[PDB]
Amino acid sequence: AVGPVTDIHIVNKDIAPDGFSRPSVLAGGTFPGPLITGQKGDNFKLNVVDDLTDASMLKSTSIHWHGFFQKGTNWADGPAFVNQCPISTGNSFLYNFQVPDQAGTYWYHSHLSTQYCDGLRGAFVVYDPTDPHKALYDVDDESTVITLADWYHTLARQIVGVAIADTTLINGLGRNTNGPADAALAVINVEAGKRYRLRLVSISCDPNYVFSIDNHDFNIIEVDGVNSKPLNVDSIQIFAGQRYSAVLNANQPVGNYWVRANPNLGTTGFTGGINSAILRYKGAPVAEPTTTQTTSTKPLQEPNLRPLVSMPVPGSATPGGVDVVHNLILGFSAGKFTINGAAFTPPSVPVLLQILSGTTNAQDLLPSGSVITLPIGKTIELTLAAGVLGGPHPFHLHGHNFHVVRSAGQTTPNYVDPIVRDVVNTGGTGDNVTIRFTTDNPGPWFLHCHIDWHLEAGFAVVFAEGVNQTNAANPTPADWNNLCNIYNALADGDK
Ligand SMILES: *[C@@H]1O[C@H](CO)[C@@H](O[C@@H]2O[C@H](CO)[C@@H](O)[C@H](O)[C@H]2NC(C)=O)[C@H](O)[C@H]1NC(C)=O
Numbered sequence: 001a002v003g004p005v006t007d008i009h010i011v012n013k014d015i016a017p018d019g020f021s022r023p024s025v026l027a028g029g030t031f032p033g034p035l036i037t038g039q040k041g042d043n044f045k046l047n048v049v050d051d052l053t054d055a056s057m058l059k060s061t062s063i064h065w066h067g068f069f070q071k072g073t074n075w076a077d078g079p080a081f082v083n084q085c086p087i088s089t090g091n092s093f094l095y096n097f098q099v100p101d102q103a104g105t106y107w108y109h110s111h112l113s114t115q116y117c118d119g120l121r122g123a124f125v126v127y128d129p130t131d132p133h134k135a136l137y138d139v140d141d142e143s144t145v146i147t148l149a150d151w152y153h154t155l156a157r158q159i160v161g162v163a164i165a166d167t168t169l170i171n172g173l174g175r176n177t178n179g180p181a182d183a184a185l186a187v188i189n190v191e192a193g194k195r196y197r198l199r200l201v202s203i204s205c206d207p208n209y210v211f212s213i214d215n216h217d218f219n220i221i222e223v224d225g226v227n228s229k230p231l232n233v234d235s236i237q238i239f240a241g242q243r244y245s246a247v248l249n250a251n252q253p254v255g256n257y258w259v260r261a262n263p264n265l266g267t268t269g270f271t272g273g274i275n276s277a278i279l280r281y282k283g284a285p286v287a288e289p290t291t292t293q294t295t296s297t298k299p300l301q302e303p304n305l306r307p308l309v310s311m312p313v314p315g316s317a318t319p320g321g322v323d324v325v326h327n328l329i330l331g332f333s334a335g336k337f338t339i340n341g342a343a344f345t346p347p348s349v350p351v352l353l354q355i356l357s358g359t360t361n362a363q364d365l366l367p368s369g370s371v372i373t374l375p376i377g378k379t380i381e382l383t384l385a386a387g388v389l390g391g392p393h394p395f396h397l398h399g400h401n402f403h404v405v406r407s408a409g410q411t412t413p414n415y416v417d418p419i420v421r422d423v424v425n426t427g428g429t430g431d432n433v434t435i436r437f438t439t440d441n442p443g444p445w446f447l448h449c450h451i452d453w454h455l456e457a458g459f460a461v462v463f464a465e466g467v468n469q470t471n472a473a474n475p476t477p478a479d480w481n482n483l484c485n486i487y488n489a490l491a492d493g494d495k
């Protein structure tokens, strides 16, 4: 692991995580990138050094630290042309932020176009020295982090039509249905009688995964950074960018057990050991499991998740019982995804810079139709009624957690004790996923589908939260101040 203070080099490397070699964009020269760690209350100083030379995956870059509120450091959030201009090749940029009030399981990824699909993604764990759940497990370290990733044989910018993941990678390793069958599988090591905090991280660009481990079950204790009441489950559907801590008791006979991550698209199932990794008990033979996937009798359902500590729902217990309601219309037309009829396209001047430079009138913010101002200090309700093609769409809000007052597949809202998280499945026809939060964080924040192909195709809006408090809230460093000057000076071939 690295952090809280570290350089992170962004490099090109040809890799073959399923036996198929291709160019990639990697943090620290590995897929996934290095695990970043720190403690609650740390000042993260993450010096991102852009060493990229391959124009086919972009030489520029920008990194988002997924799930962190970035209060007072909106400039460090990552989204290109919302919060910064990209870092240019041969340059560095220091992401300098604090995490005073968060601890849990997070991740990081490129937030420039579809570049994270080309490899720039990794896990990020913030430990809590007084974690209320600490006595529920024995082992919690780099070896208990499990990343689930989609992998494409075609470069992101060379995809024609609808992207379909070729291979599921667990901790960077996996077999392709038409690939070498001797391609290495990831191994998760346990010892009989010990309990493990499995930090399950979706670093997916698109598919959701149904995660299970043969003959084992879990207690979920954390959801997207938020401590939960322990919830006993035996399978976990995890959407793009979601995280869970799932405590596993190594209470089965010493042996090898299949770890399964079944995608919703591409090649499904487990023939030849695809979509699989290995849980190996100390003392077991070094071999593939022979175990059977038994029926999930207690699958995770989002409405069953409850915050560990009381987190009252903002507003009153009825639809629209808040200061500000936006019933967002999620659609698709003219070859692009739309929110309230508008497809997001990045502006030349980052939204934050527009505001800081003096553009504080809602009507003047660019891109026109894709920026919604929110007043500061107010309760907000968003609905995200589903049905639009390409689903199920997992929506993500930057700068915030939110209460999921109505989940996909849930008819009646819960205004008492719904889970709080940062990525939510919006479901399908008939669903009307509803989320609430309070505007306590001045700055422009993305709301978008975390299927990265859909973001690129316009499925996003920017919430310009507390526009007239944004300058005061977010003093910017000299290196941020110069990013657009450097980037705009680049030749087209060096972007
Ligand atoms: C999703 O739920 C919201 C309520 O939370 C619905 O919004 C209501 O829509 C009706 C019909 O247009 C309006 O008369 C109400 O004023 C709206 N209520 C609020 C509180 O804003 C919305 O229609 C639902 N969407 C779908 C597709 O069913």
Ligand SMILES: *[C@@H]1O[C@H](CO)[C@@H](O)[C@H](O)[C@H]1NC(C)=O
Pocket: 360, 361, 362, 373, 467, 468
């Ligand atoms: C910010 O304040 C200015 C000056 O009062 C006003 O014209 C503008 O509408 C405000 N912007 C927002 C987004 O509230």
Ligand SMILES: [Cu+2]
Pocket: 064, 066, 109, 241, 396, 450
């Ligand atoms: Cu993310």
Ligand SMILES: [Cu+2]
Pocket: 064, 065, 066, 067, 396, 397, 398, 399
């Ligand atoms: Cu995010």
Ligand SMILES: [Cu+2]
Pocket: 390, 391, 392, 393, 394, 449, 450, 451, 454, 455, 459
């Ligand atoms: Cu989507």
